[PDB]
């Protein structure tokens, strides 16, 4: 806003409110949400591992 | 290019060249290159298998 600076390249989600007050170029790479998980391990319950 | 239209709400892919000629809004949906393939007929069809 204050023109103390210019285009600010950094992690910057071009959201609804931001374009109201700033102008943003078209995104160079898309995003989204996924789940993070620890992949399973060979510790079979073995109550019945038959 | 000659404004015979003003808008085009179409599945049109933005390219380097066409943007040099035309102006585009932010992409409303994205896409890519996946692979078509038939799942392998479910479980293998083996019979009379003594």
Curated annotation (Swiss-Prot), chains A, B:
Name the source's superkingdom: Eukaryota
Name the family the entry cites.
Belongs to the glutamate-gated ion channel (TC 1.A.10.1) family. GRIK2 subfamily.
Organismal lineage: Eukaryota, Metazoa, Chordata, Craniata, Vertebrata
Functionally, this protein is described as follows: Ionotropic glutamate receptor that functions as a cation-permeable ligand-gated ion channel, gated by L-glutamate and the glutamatergic agonist kainic acid. L-glutamate acts as an excitatory neurotransmitter at many synapses in the central nervous system. Binding of the excitatory neurotransmitter L-glutamate induces a conformation change, leading to the opening of the cation channel, and thereby converts the chemical signal to an electrical impulse. The receptor then desensitizes rapidly and enters a transient inactive state, characterized by the presence of bound agonist. Independent of its ionotropic glutamate receptor activity, acts as a thermoreceptor conferring sensitivity to cold temperatures. Functions in dorsal root ganglion neurons.
For this protein, what post-translational modification is recorded in UniProt?
A: Sumoylation mediates kainate receptor-mediated endocytosis and regulates synaptic transmission. Sumoylation is enhanced by PIAS3 and desumoylated by SENP1. Ubiquitinated. Ubiquitination regulates the GRIK2 levels at the synapse by leading kainate receptor degradation through proteasome.
| Entry binding sites for L-glutamate | 11, 13, 18
Give the protein name, as stated in the record: Glutamate receptor ionotropic, kainate 2
Q: Which residues are glycosylated?
A: 41
Expression across tissues is: Highest expression is found in the olfactory lobe, piriform cortex, dentate gyrus, hippocampus, granular cell layer of the cerebellum, and in caudate-putamen.
Note in the entry: The postsynaptic actions of Glu are mediated by a variety of receptors that are named according to their selective agonists. This receptor binds domoate > kainate > quisqualate > glutamate. It does not bind AMPA without coexpression with GRIK5.
Give its localization: Cell membrane; Postsynaptic cell membrane
- What species was this sequence derived from? Rattus norvegicus
Q: Which residues of the full protein are shown?
A: 506 to 555 of 908
Q: How does it assemble?
A: Homotetramer and heterotetramer with GRIK5. Tetramers may be formed by the dimerization of dimers. Assembles into a kainate-gated homomeric channel that does not bind AMPA. Can form functional heteromeric receptors with GRIK4 and GRIK5. Can form functional heteromeric receptors with GRIK3. Interacts with DLG4. Interacts with NETO2. Interacts (via C-terminus) with KLHL17 (via kelch repeats); the interaction targets GRIK2 for degradation via ubiquitin-proteasome pathway.
